[PDB]
Structures are given as structure tokens and as C-alpha cells.
């Protein structure tokens, strides 16, 4: 009932356009690993794209001007907000269903992350083109927690490896379990093959 989308390898505008439509349909979408979001075009193109965005501020009072968010999660939150009717009541009610996170929170580390193949770099971009990581772009423009998130993301990398290697050994005993017991499960096995489930 809650969409947990992994942001690694996902294009900024293609993911935001699909999330914005799903969020407006009453679906709670949680986007995770926003530092893995990457944008087509060379890195130097996107930097001045964001640096000239920084220059756009209110002259008389910059505190009332555009709030330039530097975190990768809030940058992705900004581009979804521009894809939504946030000036209306239903637009702001939609944005409450969106939840962005840098790295992976402990609420969402022990969960399966969904992947949008339509909003993917490997699908929508030619292999000879250039792309820019949002995580590198954020720290290079004012984000202070890239190395902070990298070590905490490093910490859960072997912690899931322990779970996965235990998971393989857990189902290695499962796959070996049929190997001793075909003589008394063939009654259930063949009817699962006539209907096409193990063939």
C-alpha cells in the first residue's frame, strides 16, 4: 500500500513525473536513496543549471525569496512540487503522501524496494551519453552530508550481506529438501505442472 522506490539509477524528471501522478491518485510513495538519482547531460552543465538557480533570489529580502534546498532528497522533493498543483488544497494533501530520504532509513532498510524501469538511465539514455549524479552535485553546491551518508550507507551494506548470505543458506536447505522427498510430493507436484507453475 506504500510505494518504496529506490532512487539509484533513476532519472530526475522521469521518476518525478511518474511519482507525481501516482501521488495524486491517493497512493503514498516513499522515495529512497535520492543521492543515487542521476541526471542526463554532463556534470558541468547541471552545475551551472543549479548555480544560476542559486543566483535567482529576492533583491529586497532574500529570506522571502526562493528556498534553495541543497539535500538530494529535498532537491527531488522540489521538482515533484513543481509537477503538482501545490497552490490548491488537493496539491498540498498530495505532498503529504510523498516522503523523500537520503540514504536508507531503518524504517525502510529491511524492506523490498520497487524499481521503475521506465524512469531508468540504462533504458532511456544512450550508452555514449554523459550523466551527472545528484549526490555529487548536492555536496558540490552546499550539501554537507555526502560522506556522512556514505559511511552510514556503507554500514548497512554488509549488514544486508549477512542477511542475504543467511537467506541463501536458508533456501539452500529448502531446495535440497525436495531432493529427498520427491516420492511423496509428486501427487502435488504434477498438478502444479499441468497448470504451469513449476515447468
Amino acid at each position: 500500500q506504500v510505494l518504496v522506490l529506490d532512487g539509484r539509477g533513476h532519472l530526475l524528471g522521469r521518476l518525478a513525473a511518474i511519482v507525481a501522478k501516482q501521488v495524486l491518485l491517493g497512493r503514498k510513495v516513499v522515495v529512497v536513496r535520492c543521492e543515487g538519482i542521476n541526471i542526463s547531460g554532463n556534470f558541468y552543465r547541471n552545475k551551472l543549471k543549479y548555480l544560476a538557480f542559486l543566483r535567482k533570489r529576492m533583491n529586497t529580502n532574500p529570506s522571502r525569496g526562493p528556498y534553495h534546498f541543497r539535500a538530494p532528497s529535498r532537491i527531488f522533493w522540489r521538482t515533484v512540487r513543481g509537477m503538482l498543483p501545490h497552490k490548491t488544497k488537493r496539491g498540498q494533501a498530495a505532498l503529504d503522501r510523498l516522503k523523500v530520504f537520503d540514504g536508507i532509513p531503518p524504517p525502510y532498510d529491511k524492506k523490498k524496494r520497487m524499481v521503475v524501469p521506465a524512469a531508468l538511465k540504462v533504458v532511456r539514455l544512450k550508452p555514449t551519453r554523459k550523466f551527472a549524479y545528484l549526490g555529487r552535485l548536492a555536496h558540490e553546491v552546499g550539501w554537507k552530508y555526502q560522506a556522512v551518508t556514505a559511511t552510514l550507507e556503507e554500514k548497512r551494506k554488509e549488514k544486508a550481506k549477512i542477511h542475504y548470505r543467511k537467506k541463501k543458506q536458508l533456501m539452500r536447505l529448502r531446495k535440497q529438501a525436495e531432493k529427498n522427498v520427491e516420492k511423496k510430493i509428486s501427487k502435488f507436484t504434477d498438478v502444479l505442472k499441468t497448470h504451469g507453475l513449476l515447468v
Partner: protein
């Protein structure tokens, strides 16, 4: 049109919010960074301004006109009584910033530090930390205190210490001590935590923290001057005498 003759602007915009300070005690916005090679030591201290006077000393700067000559220098006198360590605090480090992990105080806290936890000392019953000090004479309490200390061994990255000044030795009218987190910079987390555990309820003199001929930083609140115009606050040009609505 453009300005006829160029001139730099009055007042820096880095100190733009010229409001009354929300705090009265100086705050360390950025503590010195630490490396594990150095031993554990204090990085900040809290003093009180007394007055100023002259000094006479020899200058030993090569290549100057004033080399090997006697000078006078304006020097501040800051009376710095030793602190009493009353607690420690641990900080886990998050992708959203720096977050406090757990605060562990002493068994018994001196009444000078107890002044801070009350807006009105006269009407209060002085009941602060009365049930917290009951945790140190039960066997479940000591195991919980060691479990809290062992938790800070694993997860805490930055460890500060809670120490307060001593108003009894000062001639000031007030008796309310000022609490302050002081970052302990030194070796790894484990020996850093053991050093602060030993220093609990102990006198901390100035000589442990600072030394002579050493660059330090002074943090404090400016002298109050009240509501002021642009001529006093911003040092703008006074208008001529012939102005009608003021100059």
C-alpha cells in the same frame, strides 16, 4: 542615474540581524576538530570580565623598529574560577546533522548548578534530580548506568562534557551558575569516555585547558546600548544643518 562618486557601504552584512541576543551566555558555534593522535583535553572554558590595565614587556620580533624595546599593551582581566563537572553528553551523528544520544549526570549535584534549573529559587522546593540520585544506590541502577555508558562506547562519535562555573568564589551578586557543553577532543571514543567518567564531580582548573602565549577565541554578548539611530548603529553621514525633518 548612477552614483556620482563611489564609496563603500556602511556596516557589514555578515552581522545583519542586529537583534538582542536570544542567549546571555556565549555559545560555541563550532568546536575545534579532533584527531585521535592527541591526548584527551578540554577545548573551551567560561570566564567573567573583571577589568583592564597596562603591561610592560620586552618585544622580541626580528626586523622591526620596535625590536628589543619596552611597550605598553591593553590587557583584559578575566577571573576564571575552576569548574565542577556535573555530567556528560554523547552525540550520534546523522545524515540530517548532529543529534544528541544520551545525557548522563552525576550522582549528587551541587546547589550552585541546581540554581540553573529554576526560574524562581525562593518559591521552589528544590526537588530537581531527587529521583535521579536514587539510581546510584540500587544494583539495577548501576547496571543501567554501565549499560548507558557502554551504549555510548558503540554509537557516539562526538562526546562533550557538562561543566558549570562556581559562583560561591566570585564576588558577583548572582548565585546562578552557567551550564556549558565543552567538547572533549583527544583519542578514540572509548578512552575519551573513560576520562570523562573519572573527571565527574572533580575540580577543573584553567591550567588543564589553556596555556601561556596561546591563541584563543573569545565568545560573548556585546554591551547593551538600547534603541539607536542610523548615525550611531550604522555610522552614516550626518545631514547638513539646513534639513527640515532632521539630520
Amino acid at each position: 542615474s548612477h552614483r556620482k562618486f563611489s564609496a563603500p557601504r556602511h556596516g557589514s552584512l555578515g552581522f545583519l540581524p542586529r537583534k538582542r541576543s536570544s542567549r546571555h551566555r556565549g555559545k560555541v558555534k563550532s568546536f575545534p576538530k579532533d584527531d585521535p593522535s592527541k591526548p584527551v583535553h578540554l577545548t573551551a572554558f567560561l570566564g567573567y570580565k573583571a577589568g583592564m590595565t597596562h603591561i610592560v614587556r620586552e618585544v622580541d620580533r626580528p626586523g622591526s623598529k620596535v625590536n628589543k624595546k619596552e611597550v605598553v599593551e591593553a590587557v583584559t582581566i578575566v577571573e576564571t574560577p575552576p569548574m565542577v563537572v556535573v555530567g556528560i553528553v554523547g552525540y550520534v551523528e546523522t545524515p540530517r546533522g548532529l543529534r544528541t544520544f544520551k545525557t548522563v549526570f552525576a550522582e549528587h549535584i551541587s546547589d550552585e548548578c541546581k540554581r540553573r534549573f529554576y526560574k524562581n529559587w525562593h518559591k521552589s522546593k528544590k526537588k530537581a534530580f531527587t529521583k535521579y540520585c536514587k539510581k546510584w544506590q540500587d544494583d539495577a541502577g548501576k547496571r543501567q548506568l554501565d549499560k548507558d555508558f557502554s551504549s555510548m562506547k558503540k554509537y557516539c562519535q562526538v562526546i562533550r562534557v557538562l561543566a558549570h562555573t562556581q559562583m560561591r568564589l566570585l564576588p558577583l551578586r548572582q548565585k546562578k551558575a552557567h551550564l556549558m557543553e565543552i567538547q572533549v577532543n583527544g583519542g578514540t571514543v572509548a578512552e575519551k569516555l573513560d576520562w570523562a567518567r573519572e573527571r565527574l564531580e572533580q575540580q577543573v582548573p584553567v591550567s588543564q585547558v589553556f596555556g601561556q602565549d596561546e591563541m584563543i577565541d573569545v565568545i560573548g554578548v556585546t554591551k547593551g546600548k538600547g534603541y539607536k539611530g542610523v548615525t550611531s548603529r550604522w555610522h552614516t553621514k550626518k545631514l547638513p544643518r539646513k534639513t527640515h525633518r532632521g539630520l
